[PDB]
Amino acid sequence: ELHGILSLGLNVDHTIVRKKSIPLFEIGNSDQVCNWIIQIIEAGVDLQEVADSFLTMLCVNHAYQGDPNLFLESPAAHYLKGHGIHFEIQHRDNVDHITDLLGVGSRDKSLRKTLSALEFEPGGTTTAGMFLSFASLFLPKLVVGERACLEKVQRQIQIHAEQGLIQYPTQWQSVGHMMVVFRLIRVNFVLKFLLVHQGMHMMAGHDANDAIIANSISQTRFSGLLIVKTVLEHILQKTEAGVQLHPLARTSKVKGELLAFKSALEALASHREYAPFARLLNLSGVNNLEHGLYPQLSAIALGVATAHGSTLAGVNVSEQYQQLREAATEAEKQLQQHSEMRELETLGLDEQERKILATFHSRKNEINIQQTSSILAIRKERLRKLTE
Amino acid sequence: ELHGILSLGLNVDHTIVRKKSIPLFEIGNSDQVCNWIIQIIEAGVDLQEVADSFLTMLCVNHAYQGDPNLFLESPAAHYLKGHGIHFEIQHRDNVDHITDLLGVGSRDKSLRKTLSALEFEPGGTTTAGMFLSFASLFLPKLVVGERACLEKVQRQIQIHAEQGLIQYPTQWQSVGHMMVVFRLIRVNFVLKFLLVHQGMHMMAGHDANDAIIANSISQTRFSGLLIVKTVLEHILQKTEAGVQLHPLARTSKVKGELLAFKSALEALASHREYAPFARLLNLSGVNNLEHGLYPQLSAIALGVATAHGSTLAGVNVSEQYQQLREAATEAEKQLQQHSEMRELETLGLDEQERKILATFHSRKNEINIQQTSSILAIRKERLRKLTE
Amino acid sequence: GHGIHFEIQHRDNVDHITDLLGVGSRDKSLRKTLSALEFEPGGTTTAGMF
RNA sequence: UUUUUU
RNA sequence: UUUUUU
RNA sequence: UUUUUU
């Protein structure tokens, strides 16, 4: 095969090319230490290296009541092993301040200056679970950007307060605090992976915070992977007999992009349970799935998908995909109407049964058009009010 | 075979014809030493021999937390072994200045004068990972030249800042600093190979810097090898039944170039995972793949490729390939339209299904023509504004 | 059967009469004249009447 | 010598 | 680079 | 996020 050159170095075998070691602390006052860490985050000081260790300890306090010996035996730590990430257990007896967990060295010595200056509140009421839930609120639409993150987080805050599930501290719902939390969970990988694992693997026994985390993980599936959903659901549509190709995707240049996309999906399927979270977790073969590598396939698939529903009309695209998207959308509208008349005729139904279903279909289309127009106006208003 | 003479000395067996030994240092203050090295680079002093050692230590600080004992066991060092490149571990106890890592000898004695004169900043905030990411930003379009390097780097700087991923020091985003970094990573081989290996082999667990490096390595595939992509995707197009030859490539003189090109691709395939990076890494058989050895094949392939998309119209060629490229492009346009009418007719579709797809195809072609004209105007404007 | 055939050519946005015209010497000459006319934006005359 | 978009 | 609704 | 009656 002389054409395999184009696929060289894409779906490479699993290999460990790093060594990362994280210190976990066996202590007695795990709750107090976690409260101190939460206060440290609230202040907004950057955690150079101890961010990973502090957030992992915050996670093991919520998942395993605070002892890391049980965490190293968990499936999460087993998965992190094999990618070069290991955890260290280190006993401490008297932890009167947060700083004696820090080591010695240039960065630790620099950060000790700042952590020594804070006035920690001796009595505080905030568990690790509350912080973990608030952080999980950011996971859907995290790859979109700051605006969408904060917007969705507020929306979810009302959704969870009305549900009578949790109340968050008022200082947590300010723009500044949300901004620092966005920094923190955008940069860090271990926190996001631990949230994903806990959310999508706890089969029962959810607390309030566990319920919130599970919901947020469910809402995060295929975030940043809209191309996969659109292509698989509409372009490479599967039927009872086989994989039917859509009529709008039979252009010659689309076919090559479709072949390469099949290969890229084949690579993405390697991460079994975490494939829906590839863009969030920055897994290996996720840069191979981009608009820009498959310009017209992406535009056509999004247009075909937009033709069906009414909320996909609010998805923005770059300057160079709008017109092809609209053309595909209108073509799919006309094709869908034609197929619906033919399928209505082929069905075994009466005269009155015709007319009931036909009036219903007309009303359905009308509702769909009206809702799509409303969504388009909403998107235009949002965009044009952003830029003022 | 009397014709094998023309292929003598092209795909030669693997053999080691060099011996290169690099000293790696086992120390305690790896972070401080790396900060000193970064400051040395920031000043702009040339590193005669210690460039390789300093950058390799900078890489092992980011990949393995700073101990070279783990790096010598890595697959990267195993690959470098077998090409005559070895690493030396050398313990040091008290490293109070950068200069005591240097040895004794004419070049070291000369460079000690300069490194003794710098005023190193005792406290600095810049990891090895940040420098490695900034250097990886240069890898795509590195073989093009200084202009494209700096242009793409700035574009990526906005892309990564808007994504909320990293912030770089302001002095790093000046033309002078980018210029010295271009010198440094253009000359050095070990740094580029280490960046490539880390980017394309880390399957999961990416940090922010690891994510940036992986993205930049993904964008670097087949950089400087546009001829391979064009020929393999269009000229030697492969089908369900075999490798179809394009109609425009059946001229007699193109056939011999195509045979030689098949041999050259056969040689290039020897480097399995690093074939996409052959021109960047200056691998063995990459001078055998040039425009100039295959003049008309290159021109025809680029023209056929340009006919399909709209961004390939911005690729420049030499004085002696423009007209053949344009002729091939126009011929491919007409052939593509003919094939599209025939393929539309052969498909099993209705009357209305005709007209929907035919209007869609017309709109698609119109959009394509408009975008190609815009890109051509952009290229003309860029070139004619460069030369003023 | 007498050598006269018709071509179907799709156009999306026809804001003026001139963009139906092609490119060429005669079309380029006639575009000058059709560009100078002041077409009446609202008119009441069908093709059937003509 | 490379020249586009990602 | 991502862009919707959930 | 759920929305009725039992």
- Given a contact cutoff of 8 angstroms between Cβ atoms, the answer to whether B234 and B304 are in contact is yes
Chains A & B: contacts with CB separation below 8 Å = 149
**Angle at alpha carbon of residue A191, lines to A46 and A24, rounded to 5°:** 80
With beta carbons less than 8 A apart as the criterion, state whether B303 and B249 touch.
no
Structure tokens at A388: 């003022």
The verdict on a CB contact (< 8 Å) between B364 and A324 is: yes
Instruction: Please give the single-letter amino acid code of residue B264.
Output: A
Give the whole-angstrom CA distance, residue B335 versus residue B290.
28
CB B139 within 8 A of CB B220: yes
Pairing type for strands A85-91 and A20-26 reads: parallel
Contacts of B360 in chain A (CB under 8 A): 248, 327-328, 331
Sign of the Cα pseudo-torsion (A155, A159, A162, A168, in order):
negative
Q: Is A87 helix (H, G, I), strand (E, B) or coil?
A: strand
* CA–CA separation, A90 and A72 (whole Å): 13
Distances (CA, A) of A323 to A317, B96, B195, C12: 10, 63, 39, 12
Other beta carbons within 10 angstroms of residue B323's beta carbon come to 11
Q: How far apart are CA A193 and CA A196, in angstroms?
A: 5
| Interface test with chain C among B354, B361, B362, B373, by most C beta carbons within 10 Å | B362
Spatial contact of B196 and B281, defined as CB atoms under 8 Å apart: yes
Using alpha carbons, select from B269, B296, B271, B359 the residue that is nearest to residue B83. B271
Mutation pick from C7, C8, C9, C10 vs chain B, by most beta carbons of B within 10 Å, is: C10
CB within 7 A of strand D (chain B, 289-308)? 290-292
Distance from CA of B335 to the nearest CA of C (A): 18
Q: What are phi and psi of B21, to 5 degrees?
A: -125, 125
Distance CA A283, CA A268 (A): 9
Interface of A with B in 347-386 (CB under 8 A): none
Residues constituting chain A = 388
CA dist A386 and A117 (Å) reads: 39
Could B218 and A186 be called an inter-chain contact, meaning their C-beta atoms sit closer than 8 Å? no
Contacts of A222 (CB under 8 A, 6+ apart): A228, A229, A276
Residues A66-94 as b or e (16 or more Cβ within 10 Å = b): bebeebbebebbebbeebbbebeeeeeee
Residue of B nearest to A299 (CA): B364
Residue with tokens 């056929």: B304
C1’ F5 / CA A206, Å: 30
**B touches which chains (3+ CB pairs under 8 A)?**
A, C
Cβ pair B206:A186 closer than 8 A: no
Q: Which residue is nearest to nucleotide E2 (CA to C1')?
A: A144
Cα–Cα distance, B387 to A223 (Å, whole number): 45
What protein residues sit with their CB closer than 7 Å to strand F? A 159, 162-163
Given CB atoms, is B75 within the 8 Å cutoff of chain A?
yes
Which CB contacts under 8 angstroms, 24+ apart, belong to A131-135? Answer: A131/A38, A131/A41, A131/A58, A132/A58, A132/A59, A132/A62, A132/A195, A132/A209, A132/A213, A133/A166, A133/A208, A133/A209, A133/A212, A133/A213, A133/A216, A134/A168, A134/A172, A134/A181, A135/A181, A135/A184, A135/A185, A135/A191, A135/A195
Residue B189 to residues B183, B279, B281, B283, C46, Cα–Cα distance (Å): 12, 12, 7, 11, 76
Q: How many helices (H) and strands (E) does chain A have?
A: 16, 2
DSSP code of A121? -
Q: How far is B308 from chain C (nearest CA, A)?
A: 21
- What CA–CA distances, in Å, run from B66 to A206, B58, B129, B132, B177? 41, 8, 12, 14, 26
Q: Which chain C residues are within 8 Å of B359, Cβ to Cβ?
A: 10
Q: Which helix (H) or strand (E) holds A275?
A: none
User: Do residues A154 and A173 touch, judged by C-beta distance below 8 A?
Assistant: yes
Structural tokens at position B186: 């253009």
Q: Which of residues 45-104 of B touch strand D (CB under 7 A)?
A: none
Structure solved via: cryo-EM
Cβ-Cβ contacts under 8 Å, C7 against chain B: none
The answer for residues whose C-beta is within 8 angstroms of residue B278's C-beta and 6 or more apart is B225, B268, B271, B285, B286, B289
Instruction: Say which DSSP state A4 is in.
Output: G
Report the C-alpha gap between B199 and B94 in whole angstroms. Answer: 33
Distance from CA(A308) to C1'(F3), angstroms, rounded? 27
Distances, alpha carbon A57 to alpha carbons A26, A34, A192, A200, in Å: 10, 8, 14, 20
- Cβ count near A315 (within 10 Å): 14
With H, G, I as helix, E, B as strand and everything else as coil, classify residue A198: helix
As beta bridge partners, residue B238 has: B243
What dihedral angle (degrees, nearest 10) is formed by the CA atoms of B341, B346, B349, B353? 0
